[PDB]
Design a binder for this molecule. Structure first.
Ligand SMILES: [Mg+2]
Ligand SMILES: [Zn+2]
Ligand SMILES: [Zn+2]
Lengths: 151, 48, 49, 102, 48, 515, 49
DNA sequence: CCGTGTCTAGCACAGGGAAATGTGTCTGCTTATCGGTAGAGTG
DNA sequence: CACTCTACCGATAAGCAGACGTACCTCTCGACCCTGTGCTAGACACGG
RNA sequence: UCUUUUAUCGAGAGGU
């Protein structure tokens, strides 16, 4: 059961860190490279994990036991704000950071608004969707010229 | 943090030279003409 | 019509000339206001009175 | 990059074709598959990139149920689910699929 | 030329302060020289 | 060649069978290629350009710039001419289609033989670079204060390097102790990247001269100056608690901002590389030479304590010998350095992306040449001298429009200089005509209103220097007998003549007349 | 505008209250105003442009 | 050997969103130091 | 009935940050950037 | 029987 995996005081700490918008995945990557490269050396990077949630723009979270390891993980990283802005997360806040998810809507016969092309902004009825599940056939009031000025 | 951002917008809607924090820029990088500045100054309203 | 010329036409005393220079010969406007609240928020319509 | 639906690991797609999944390929056999099979067991759509450096002592890894896997990049959420025929085959192998799509 | 370039604007701003300070002192119909709200400045204008 | 090469690197662990491959990506840059201006038609053809059509069709007048590249791969398990942009050309300079030809063809080319050149052409217009002006660098100035201040005398210096002719850091020394006010008459300095006024004995002993005979030996040049020696006492009585090197090194290392937790071990190394680099960079940046800097600081404190006790007048801030004009050379260089750094870093980023997919970056496509072209054309086109995204806080009014009207109001425009002191604060010291302006600038001609005395117009027989290297002079000196520094000793050298070269103090001699 | 109308007449910058005075009109050709020279003392004016 | 179809790459257009670190005088108002008591716990 | 030992309000500076630069009039010369997605064109491979 | 259009922000060069 997932309820037996809840964090305790014995688990490492998690710090949040502010990073350049859009560079959160890059920072997570860079931290992994540094960790793996230093494994088994006399100066290992003493972090356990790092991650970035899309819903939380401009932040990376880093798992460790000492704050100094956070500074070590980010040292020289050009995507991280130099101000000593890291913040501590409470144990009681940990699991919510890792919640995976109900918009998943769209039904045949319903209305949607088109987001691209000459029909951008127009209301359309959903007629049907592709077998694979990607594109939907829409019923639309046309915007035509009957070839009037074609060459 | 987002609520603090809303406070920041409501703040820079009526004052641009808030001593204490950077001026909210335009799209093209120029300081916004907050309402506080249409009035004061030699070339505002009550002088102009 | 700078502030200093205003000060001079105050020094002469011609109040009507000033009331003119700063109204008719520039930008006159009319506003319908209430008498209880005291704001320029009156919704008016004229040809229907 | 694609994410394995079984273990959540994130790798360049061709890796799933070249070497299989490093955590799962004993049962998934992606190494010896076609692209249709790889694309049914791995997803191009995933969210929440996680660097796991120390699987076995990370609480983050334990929560995501990747604590017995190899250090690497993992995804918090992987969209899609394993095809019912593959789930059935995994179950024949004593493997229980817990979907990672939320 | 430098001194001439300096002092004139100084004197102008000084005059603006003076005029904006003294611009509501009238001579009412009995000799009093009251301001805008009755503070008798001079009881009889010019003392004579 | 300020930044010769670029270097990437790749360590290992790339989904393999435990096999490292240390791979570096290195790029080198040798050789410039400058071609005469050329028009690239919209049809696609190209042909030579001349300034007449450059003016008529509202065109720019620039030259392509080619730069060579070269790559190399480092490993260990355990191309050709790239067009980097165009540069506007000044009329009648060697790299122009008008330095030759002579008259008859000048007439056929629709150009007047009375025009003298000297102006740029941007977007079918004629631009001029107002000779800008700055203050001289790498000398020693000693100014004073007004009196409601706890500081009575200040020594100041701006340090700038030579290859590049650009400024780096600012260093100061402040003398406290108002005349019988402020209690202690102590001396406190200021460093780059620090927080508090660090005393002086602490920087002496911090550089490695812990005794006192060496310090009072460096500062004063006589053993009878018991007046300066009388003022020195509180400096040593202030620097008594520190007696050796390391505790002063870390005494400085703890203040210098940095992080917070670089204790003794790493923080001493922090303060050390601080006291090699930023502090007095125009002297040197190689180790085993800190004696030189100690001698220099000795001279500086000496001059300060010569100005404080009133044996020599305070420096005048407007003596025209202490000023340097920035013409068309020292301006175009800085902007191009900035833009070139930007191009370099963009190439860096594109290389990062095209190597993650494990491909070859074509170099022909890894260069967006519009950076330098649009930057130069913008800065010369508008005048806001600097960049674009930083509109404010950047200097304005350096490139103006030529004043074509009469033939005097043009020669009187290709000779003008401008001092950026401002318009506020009135004051009548930077506006007056100084005594040292005899024959170097004009006394009468000047605008009126806000800028009287600021805008200048050079005399009829003036000239601006170019810039010669100093190593030959050093050879001509060390021929006849310039004694090196390290052999110095002030009690041994109490009658020597101290030879300066470009400000940095390099040696001493004895008999000066023959030299 | 015809003969003998009273027009106000002003120069910037006006200081004392004599820099704004009403003159009588007199139509003349050419393109410039005209003043009797005796009124060049309150205006601080001269005909040098 | 030629033609057609599919896939990949490049260019153009549209939509969304910021940053590597790099002038001088006055007055009033908001914070630390100083005293000074001015009391009461004390021998 | 000398004594301290602390809770008061003075009176200090004390440091600080910001608020403020004559009047009117004429003329000439300039304009968002970056990233992502979609569409079109070209090249290569396969089939007839 | 009328009517009838002059962006915007900023920078600089000028005249009393
Ligand atoms: Mg005149
Ligand atoms: Zn009402
Ligand atoms: Zn897997």
């Amino acid at each position: 059961p997932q309820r037996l995996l809840i964090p305790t005081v014995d688990d490492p700490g998690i710090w949040g860190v502010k990073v350049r918008l859009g560079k959160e995945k890059d920072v997570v990557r860079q931290i992994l490279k540094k960790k793996l490269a230093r494994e088994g050396t006399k100066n290992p990077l003493e972090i356990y994990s790092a991650f970035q949630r899309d819903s939380f723009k401009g932040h990376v979270y880093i798992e460790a036991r000492k704050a100094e390891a956070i500074n070590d993980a980010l040292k020289g990283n050009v995507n991280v704000f130099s101000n000593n802005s890291k913040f501590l997360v409470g144990i009681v806040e940990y699991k919510d950071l890792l919640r995976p998810v109900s918009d998943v809507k769209l039904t045949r016969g319903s209305y949607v608004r088109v987001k691209n092309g000459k029909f951008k902004g127009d209301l359309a009825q959903v007629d049907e969707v592709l077998e694979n599940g990607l594109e939907a056939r829409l019923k639309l009031v046309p915007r035509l010229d009957y070839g009037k000025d074609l060459s | 943090e987002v609520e603090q951002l809303l406070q920041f917008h409501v703040a820079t809607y009526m004052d641009n030279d808030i001593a204490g924090q950077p001026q909210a820029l335009q799209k093209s990088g120029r300081p916004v003409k907050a309402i506080r500045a249409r009035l004061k100054g030699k070339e505002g309203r009550l002088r102009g | 019509f700078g502030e200093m010329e205003r000060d001079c036409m105050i020094a002469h005393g011609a109040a009507g000339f000033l009331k003119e220079r700063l109204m008719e010969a520039s930008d006159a406007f009319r506003v319908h206001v209430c008498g209880i609240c005291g704001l320029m928020s009156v919704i008016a319509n004229l040809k229907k009175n | 990059e694609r994410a394995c639906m079984l273990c959540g690991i994130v790798l360049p797609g061709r890796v799933f074709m070249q070497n299989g999944c490093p955590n799962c390929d004993s049962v998934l056999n992606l190494r010896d598959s076609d692209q249709a099979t790889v694309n049914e067991c791995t997803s191009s759509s995933f969210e929440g990139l996680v660097a796991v450096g120390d699987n076995e002592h990370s609480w983050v890894a334990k929560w995501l149920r990747v604590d017995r896997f190899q250090p690497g990049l993992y995804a918090v959420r992987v969209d899609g689910r394993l095809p019912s025929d593959i789930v059935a085959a995994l179950e024949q192998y004593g493997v229980y699929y817990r979907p990672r799509d939320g | 030329l430098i001194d001439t370039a300096v002092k004139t604007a100084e004197t102008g701003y000084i005059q603006r302060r003076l005029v904006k300070a003294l611009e509501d002192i009238m001579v009412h119909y009995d000799g009093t020289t009251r301001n805008s709200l009755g503070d008798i400045i001079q009881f009889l204008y010019g003392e004579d | 060649w300020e930044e010769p090469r670029l270097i990437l690197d790749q360590p290992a662990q790339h989904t393999n069978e435990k096999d490292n491959i240390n791979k570096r990506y290195e790029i080198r840059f040798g050789k410039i290629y400058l071609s005469r201006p050329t028009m690239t038609e919209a049809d696609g053809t190209t042909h030579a350009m001349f300034p007449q059509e450059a003016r008529l069709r509202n065109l720019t007048y620039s030259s392509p710039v080619y730069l060579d590249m070269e790559k190399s791969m480092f490993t260990s398990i355990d191309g050709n001419k790239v067009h980097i942009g165009k540069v506007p050309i000044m009329l009648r300079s060697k790299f122009c289609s008008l330095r030759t030809l002579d008259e008859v063809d000048l007439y056929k080319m629709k150009e007047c033989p009375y025009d003298m050149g000297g102006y740029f052409v941007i977007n079918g217009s004629e631009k001029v670079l107002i000779a800008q002006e700055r203050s001289a660098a790498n000398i020693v100035q000693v100014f004073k204060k007004a009196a409601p201040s706890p500081i009575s005398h200040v020594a100041e210096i701006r340090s700038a390097l030579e290859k590049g002719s650009r400024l780096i850091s600012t260093m100061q020394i402040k003398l406290y102790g108002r005349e019988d006010k402020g209690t202690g008459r102590t001396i406190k300095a200021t460093l780059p990247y620090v927080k508090q006024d660090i005393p002086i004995v602490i920087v002496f002993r911090a550089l490695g001269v812990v005794p006192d005979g060496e310090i009072l030996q460096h500062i004063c040049y006589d053993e009878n100056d018991w007046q300066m020696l009388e003022m020195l006492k509180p400096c040593i009585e202030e620097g008594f608690v520190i007696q050796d090197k390391e505790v002063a090194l870390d005494f400085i290392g703890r203040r210098g901002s940095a992080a917070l937790g670089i204790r003794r071990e790493k923080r001493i190394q922090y303060a050390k590389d601080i006291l090699q680099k930023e502090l007095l960079p125009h002297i040197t940046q190689e180790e085993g030479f800190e004696t030189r800097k100690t001698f220099f600081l000795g001279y500086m404190v000496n001059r300060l304590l010569l100005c404080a006790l009133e044996r020599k007048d305070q420096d005048d801030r407007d003596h025209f010998g202490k000023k340097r004009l920035d013409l068309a050379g020292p301006l175009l260089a800085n902007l191009f350095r900035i833009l070139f750094r930007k191009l370099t870093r963009e190439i860096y980023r594109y290389m990062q992306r095209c190597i993650e997919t494990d491909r070859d970056f074509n170099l022909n496509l890894a260069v967006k040449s519009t950076t330098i072209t649009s930057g130069l054309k913008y800065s010369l086109a508008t005048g806001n001298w600097g960049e674009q995204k930083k509109a404010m806080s950047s200097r304005a009014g350096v490139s103006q429009v030529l004043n074509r009207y009469t033939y005097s109001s043009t020669l009187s425009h290709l000779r003008r200089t401008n001092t950026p002191i401002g318009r506020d604060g009135k004051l009548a010291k930077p506006r007056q005509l100084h005594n040292t302006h005899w024959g170097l600038v004009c006394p009468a001609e000047t605008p009126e209103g806000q800028a009287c005395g600021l805008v200048k117009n050079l005399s009829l027989l003036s000239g601006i220097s170019i810039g010669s290297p100093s190593e030959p002079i050093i050879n001509f000196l060390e021929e006849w007998g310039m004694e090196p520094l390290e052999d110095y000793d002030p009690a041994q050298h109490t009658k020597s003549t101290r030879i300066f070269v470009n400000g940095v103090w390099t040696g001493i001699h004895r008999d000066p007349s023959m030299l | 505008l015809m003969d003998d109308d009273p027009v106000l007449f002003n120069r910037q910058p006006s200081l004392h209250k004599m820099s704004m005075m009403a003159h009588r009109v007199k139509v003349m050709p050419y393109s410039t105003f005209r003043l009797n020279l005796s009124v060049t003392s309150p205006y601080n004016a001269d005909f040098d442009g």
